[PDB]
Amino acid sequence: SSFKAADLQLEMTQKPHKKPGPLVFGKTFTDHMLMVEWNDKGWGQPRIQPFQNLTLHPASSSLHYSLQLFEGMKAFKGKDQQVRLFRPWLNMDRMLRSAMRLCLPSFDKLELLECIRRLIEVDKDWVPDAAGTSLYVRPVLIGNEPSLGVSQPTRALLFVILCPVGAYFPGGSVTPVSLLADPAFIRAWVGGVGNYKLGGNYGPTVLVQQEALKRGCEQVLWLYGPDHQLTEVGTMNIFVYWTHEDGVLELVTPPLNGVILPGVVRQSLLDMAQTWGEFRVVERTITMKQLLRALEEGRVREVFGSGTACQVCPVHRILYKDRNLHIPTMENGPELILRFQKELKEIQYGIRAHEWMFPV
Amino acid sequence: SSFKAADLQLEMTQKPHKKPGPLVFGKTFTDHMLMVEWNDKGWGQPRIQPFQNLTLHPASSSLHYSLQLFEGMKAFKGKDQQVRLFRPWLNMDRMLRSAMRLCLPSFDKLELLECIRRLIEVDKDWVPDAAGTSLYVRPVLIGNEPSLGVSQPTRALLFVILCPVGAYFPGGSVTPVSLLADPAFIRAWVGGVGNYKLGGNYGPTVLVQQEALKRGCEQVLWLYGPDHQLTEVGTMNIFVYWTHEDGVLELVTPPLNGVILPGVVRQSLLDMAQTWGEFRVVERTITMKQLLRALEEGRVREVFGSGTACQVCPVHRILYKDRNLHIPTMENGPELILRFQKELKEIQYGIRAHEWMFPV
Numbered sequence: 001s002s003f004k005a006a007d008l009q010l011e012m013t014q015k016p017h018k019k020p021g022p023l024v025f026g027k028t029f030t031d032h033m034l035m036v037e038w039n040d041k042g043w044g045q046p047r048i049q050p051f052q053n054l055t056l057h058p059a060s061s062s063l064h065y066s067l068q069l070f071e072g073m074k075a076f077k078g079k080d081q082q083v084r085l086f087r088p089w090l091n092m093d094r095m096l097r098s099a100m101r102l103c104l105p106s107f108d109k110l111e112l113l114e115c116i117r118r119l120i121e122v123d124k125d126w127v128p129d130a131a132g133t134s135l136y137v138r139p140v141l142i143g144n145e146p147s148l149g150v151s152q153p154t155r156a157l158l159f160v161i162l163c164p165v166g167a168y169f170p171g172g173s174v175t176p177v178s179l180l181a182d183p184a185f186i187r188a189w190v191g192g193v194g195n196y197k198l199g200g201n202y203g204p205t206v207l208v209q210q211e212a213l214k215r216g217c218e219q220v221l222w223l224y225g226p227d228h229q230l231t232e233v234g235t236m237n238i239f240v241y242w243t244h245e246d247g248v249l250e251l252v253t254p255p256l257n258g259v260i261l262p263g264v265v266r267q268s269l270l271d272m273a274q275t276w277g278e279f280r281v282v283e284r285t286i287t288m289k290q291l292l293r294a295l296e297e298g299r300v301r302e303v304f305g306s307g308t309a310c311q312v313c314p315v316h317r318i319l320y321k322d323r324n325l326h327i328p329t330m331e332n333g334p335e336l337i338l339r340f341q342k343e344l345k346e347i348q349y350g351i352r353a354h355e356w357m358f359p360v
Numbered sequence: 361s362s363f364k365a366a367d368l369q370l371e372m373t374q375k376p377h378k379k380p381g382p383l384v385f386g387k388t389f390t391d392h393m394l395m396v397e398w399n400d401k402g403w404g405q406p407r408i409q410p411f412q413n414l415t416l417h418p419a420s421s422s423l424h425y426s427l428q429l430f431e432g433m434k435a436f437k438g439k440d441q442q443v444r445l446f447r448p449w450l451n452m453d454r455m456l457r458s459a460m461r462l463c464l465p466s467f468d469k470l471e472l473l474e475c476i477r478r479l480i481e482v483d484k485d486w487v488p489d490a491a492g493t494s495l496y497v498r499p500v501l502i503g504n505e506p507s508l509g510v511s512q513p514t515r516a517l518l519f520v521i522l523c524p525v526g527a528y529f530p531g532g533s534v535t536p537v538s539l540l541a542d543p544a545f546i547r548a549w550v551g552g553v554g555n556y557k558l559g560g561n562y563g564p565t566v567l568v569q570q571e572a573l574k575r576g577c578e579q580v581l582w583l584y585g586p587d588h589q590l591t592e593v594g595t596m597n598i599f600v601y602w603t604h605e606d607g608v609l610e611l612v613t614p615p616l617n618g619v620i621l622p623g624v625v626r627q628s629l630l631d632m633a634q635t636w637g638e639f640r641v642v643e644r645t646i647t648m649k650q651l652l653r654a655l656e657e658g659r660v661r662e663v664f665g666s667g668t669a670c671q672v673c674p675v676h677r678i679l680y681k682d683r684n685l686h687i688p689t690m691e692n693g694p695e696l697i698l699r700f701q702k703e704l705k706e707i708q709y710g711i712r713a714h715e716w717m718f719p720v
C-alpha cells in the first residue's frame with residue numbers, strides 16, 4: 001500500500017519566517033514540511049503543514065534502536081526561474097532500499113516524489129537563485145513503535161524538510177581539502193549496512209571527524225581491509241584520476257561491494273565519463289599502496305570526492321598516520337573536476353535541457 | 361559540570377494510571393519519568409515528571425544521525441517489599457563510555473544513579489513481586505541539535521523510563537532456544553562500535569531476526585571472522601561449559617576485544633564461577649570448528665546466553681550451513697545454568713545479602 005499525492009492536505013503556515021538576506025548548511029529551514037504517518041491501517045493521508053516539532057512517545061523505536069533513515073537531494077533554480085530536481089528517482093530508489101533493510105513500510109516512489117514536488121512548489125520562493133545555490137531536500141523515515149521490543153515496527157513516520165543552501169565554494173572556485181587517513185577508523189564492513197543511508201552509519205563518525213580536526217585535517221579518508229582500501233571521503237564517494245600501473249589513463253572509484261554508499265553524484269560522474277569515451281572508467285578497489293606508488297611515479301592527476309553537498313570536491317593532502325602526502329590535483333587544472341562541474345551546472349540549472357532533471 | 365540529584369524537581373501525576381492485572385515486555389510504562397536537558401549553558405536541573413511525550417525539532421540529530429544510546433537494568437522487589445537494583449554502577453559506567461563515543465555530554469554517574477533511585481522510589485508500587493518479575497529501567501541519552509550538519513551536538517536530552525515486566529520463563533523453568541548461525545550476517549566489526557550500547561547496533565538486526573524465524577530458529581547466533589567465532593546470541597553474551605581440548609573442564613566466554621558488548625550479567629557469571637573455584641573460568645575466542653569437534657567428542661555440557669532479559673538462557677540447537685546441530689544443554693541438567701539462576705535469584709530478591717544490590 002501507499003499514500004497518494006491526490007490525497008494531500010495543505011495546511012498553510014500562519015507564522016511565515018523571514019527569509020535570509022550567509023547561508024550556513026542545514027541550519028535554516030523553510031515554512032512547510034511534508035508529513036505522513038503509518039500504522040496497522042496503513043498510510044494516513046499525506047500533508048503539507050507548517051514546519052513544526054515532532055511529538056514522540058519516549059519508547060519510540062526511532063530513538064532506542066535507530067530505526068531511521070534519510071535522503072539528501074537538491075532542487076536548482078535556473079535563469080528561466082524554473083525549479084528542477086536532479087535525478088530524484090534515484091534518491092527514491094535508494095530510500096526504498098533503506099526502508100526495506102530496516103523493515104520499515106514500503107511506499108510508492110512516484111507518489112512520494114509528487115508529494116515532494118508539491119511541497120517544493122509551496123515553498124518555491126525559498127529556493128535561492130544565486131550562483132552555486134540550491135534548495136536541499138531532506139526526507140526521513142523513522143519507526144515509531146511505543147515499545148522496547150527490538151522488532152519490526154507497527155507504526156512509522158515519513159517527513160520531508162527543506163533548507164536553502166549557499167554555494168559550497170563561496171569564492172566561485174573549487175578549493176581543495178585535506179584528509180586524515182588512519183586505518184584505526186572503520187566506517188562500514190562487508191556484511192554491514194554502510195551501503196544504506198541509515199542514521200546509524202553517521203553517529204559514530206562524529207568523534208573521528210573531531211580527531212581529523214585535532215590532527216589538522218578537514219575530513220576523514222575512510223580506510224578498509226588489510227590492504228588499506230580507500231573507500232569514502234567524509235560523506236562523499238572517492239574518485240582517482242590517474243595513469244594506472246598498465247599505462248592506461250583511467251578514472252577509478254571503488255565498487256559497490258557493500259562498504260560504499262551508492263551516491264547519485266557518483267553514478268552521474270561514471271555515466272558522464274563513460275559517455276565521453278575518452279579514457280577508461282572503472283569500478284575497482286584503491287589501496288594506499290597503489291596511491292603511494294602512483295604519487296611517487298607522478299601518475300596521479302586528480303583526487304576528489306563526489307556528493308550532493310559539493311558535487312565535486314578536490315583533495316590536495318592526505319595525512320596517512322605520520323606521512324603527509326601532497327596530492328597534485330590543483331596543479332593538474334583540476335581539468336576533470338572542472339569539466340564535471342561545468343557539465344553538471346549546465347544540466348542542473350537548465351542551461352541544457354536533460355532527462356536527468358525533474359521539473360517542479 | 362554534571363546535574364545534581366540535590367537540585368531535583370518533582371511534579372506528580374494528576375491522574376495515576378492503573379497497574380496491570382499478561383504483560384508483554386516493553387509495552388507498559390509507569391507514571392513518571394526522569395528528564396534532564398543539556399545545552400551551551402550545560403546541564404539544567406534534573407526533574408521527575410509525569411510520563412509524557414518528547415517534543416523534538418524535525419532536524420534532531422537523534423533522528424538523522426543516530427546520536428542515541430541506552431541502558432537496560434532491573435530493580436527487584438523482595439518478600440520484605442524492599443526494592444533493589446542489580447549492580448547499577450556498571451550500567452552507569454557503560455552508559456558514560458557510550459556517551460563519550462558519540463560525543464554526547466558527560467555526567468556524574470552517582471548523580472544519575474541517585475536521580476534514578478529517586479524516580480524508582482516515586483514509582484515503587486509499580487515494581488511487581490511475583491516470582492521472576494521485576495521493573496526494567498531504561499535510561500536514554502540522545503543528541504538534539506536542530507541542524508543537519510553531522511557534528512558534536514550542542515544540545516542533548518537524558519531521560520529514564522520504567523517498565524514492569526513478567527517472568528522471562530512463564531512456566532518458572534528454563535526453556536532452551538534454537539539459533540541460526542549464518543556467517544553472512546555481521547553484528548559488529550573490530551574498530552567499530554559493537555562494544556557500546558548504541559541504538560545503531562540494533563536497527564540492522566531486525567531483518568536478520570526475521571530471517572531466523574523464517575528458517576525455523578528463535579534467535580541469531582552472531583558469527584565473526586573467517587574462523588567463525590561465536591560472539592553473541594541475539595542481544596545476549598554467549599557462554600560455553602565444556603571439557604576443553606586439553607581435558608580440563610571450563611567455562612568460556614569470548615573476550616572483550618571490541619565486537620562483544622560487556623554485559624553486566626556476563627561479568628557476574630564470571631565473577632561467581634571464579635569465586636567458587638571449582639573449575640577453570642576463561643575469556644577466550646570460541647570457533648565453530650572447536651564447537652563442532654567438542655560436540656562430536658561428547659565434550660560439551662551446556663551452551664547459554666546471558667543478559668538482563670532472562671539472566672541465563674539455554675541453547676539446544678544451532679542451524680549452521682543448512683545442518684542442525686543438537687546442543688545437549690538440557691541433558692546436562694542444565695546444572696550450571698540452574699546454579700547460576702538460583703544464586704542470582706537469591707541475591708536479586710535479597711534472600712542473601714550482597715554488595716551487588718543497590719537499595720532504593
Ligand SMILES: *Cc1c(COP(=O)(O)O)cnc(C)c1O
Binds near residue numbers: 309
Ligand atoms: C550521502 C552520501 C554519499 C554521496 O551520496 P550522493 O547521493 O551523491 O549525495 C557518499 N557517501 C556517504 C557515506 C553518504 O552518506
Ligand SMILES: *Cc1c(COP(=O)(O)O)cnc(C)c1O
Binds near residue numbers: 592594621666669
Ligand atoms: C545488552 C546487551 C548484552 C547483555 O548485557 P547485560 O548488561 O548483561 O544485560 C549482550 N549483548 C548485546 C549485543 C547487548 O545489547
Ligand SMILES: Cc1c(C(=O)O)sc2ncn(C)c(=O)c12
Binds near residue numbers: 309509510
Ligand atoms: C548538503 C551539505 C552538507 C551535508 O550533507 O552535511 S554540508 C554542506 N556544506 C555546504 N553545502 C553547500 C551543502 O550543500 C552541504
Ligand SMILES: Cc1c(C(=O)O)sc2ncn(C)c(=O)c12
Binds near residue numbers: 148149432496529
Ligand atoms: C528486557 C527484556 C527484553 C529486551 O530487552 O528485548 S525481551 C524480554 N522478554 C522478557 N523479559 C522478562 C524481559 O525482561 C525482556
Ligand SMILES: [Cl-]
Binds near residue numbers: 195258
Ligand atoms: Cl549497493
Ligand SMILES: [Cl-]
Binds near residue numbers: 618622
Ligand atoms: Cl569493552
